[PDB]
């Protein structure tokens with residue numbers, strides 16, 4: 001057993017050094033100067049001569065020069081199951097989904113209506129305002145660790161912004177989609193072809209590939225974006241509705257969309273569906289549908305979910321053309 005203050009100091013310093021190493025080497029974007037970094041590494045090196053057991057092969061000092069950052073896609077459990085969505089392709093089906101809902105919950109349900117993004121699903125975990133894990137869908141219970149790749153996404157903050165209205169939760173699991181803008185997708189393809197590589201067939205594939213990189217510096221230099229859509233497990237945050245959840249997410253610095261609307265009944269839902277059927281092409285990223293979700297979280301709890309999907313939401317899918 002090492003003395004506690006020595007251990008405290010070392011974790012903090014090593015944590016800080018490593019973050020800076022990652023910012024400079026992987027992301028190519030430091031947030032402190034070179035001078036300051038140098039000082040930091042020296043201290044941590046001293047402390048490790050003063051206390052040799054602290055120096056291990058995983059330390060940022062001994063054995064990490066510009067390296068140690070790699071993604072291995074190992075399994076990691078999601079705190080809450082990350083399911084898929086049921087789909088509706090015709091007006092009858094949607095009405096049918098709403099009939100089933102009205103009958104169960106009775107005019108008390110309002111519907112958040114969002115754009116369905118055609119990209120890769122990503123799940124982030126923030127513990128005390130700090131991002132700890134990012135993962136793929138996988139089987140629903142377990143996905144893959146692409147933590148470093150997510151840390152390079154500009155949209156995803158490392159730490160959550162504190163505030164008066166919305167206190168940072170102890171644990172927050174957030175789902176959202178990663179994607180490329182069409183222009184960026186084209187641009188990346190040109191770049192790839194310029195180095196002799198094969199281009200990607202669509203933005204969905206391109207973003208998935210850009211995210212799933214063993215060397216995350218590859219990912220850092222690609223312009224992935226993310227828009228958050230969902231909550232998984234949370235502690236210290238109990239929003240009454242999903243629309244109110246997005247206010248908090250936004251206050252904390254997470255990225256949310258500007259095209260979400262709150263309809264009051266199925267008629268309102270139908271208007272949005274019709275509207276995005278006509279305007280979806282004006283958005284800069286791929287939209288294949290609209291997600292319809294009962295907004296109040298108590299109603300969501302009552303309706304629950306099946307093994308594969310929730311019953312409180314349905315995604316209307318457009319014909320592709």
Ligand SMILES: Nc1ncnc2c1ncn2[C@@H]1O[C@H](COP(=O)(O)O)[C@@H](O)[C@H]1O
Pocket residue numbers: 083084085086087114115116117118121177229230291315
């Ligand atoms: N706004 C959104 N809300 C929820 N899930 C979404 C949204 N946009 C995309 N998705 C993803 O779309 C996946 C499947 O939808 P689908 O297109 O029906 O297969 C969902 O499970 C989510 O991962």
Ligand SMILES: NC(=O)c1ccc[n+]([C@@H]2O[C@H](COP(=O)(O)O)[C@@H](O)[C@H]2O)c1
Pocket residue numbers: 020021023024025030031032033034035037038065066
């Ligand atoms: N500002 C930073 O965050 C930061 C982080 C890591 C390394 N660096 C710079 O990296 C260089 C390391 O040297 P070599 O990789 O060329 O040995 C140093 O000059 C160091 O200051 C800067």
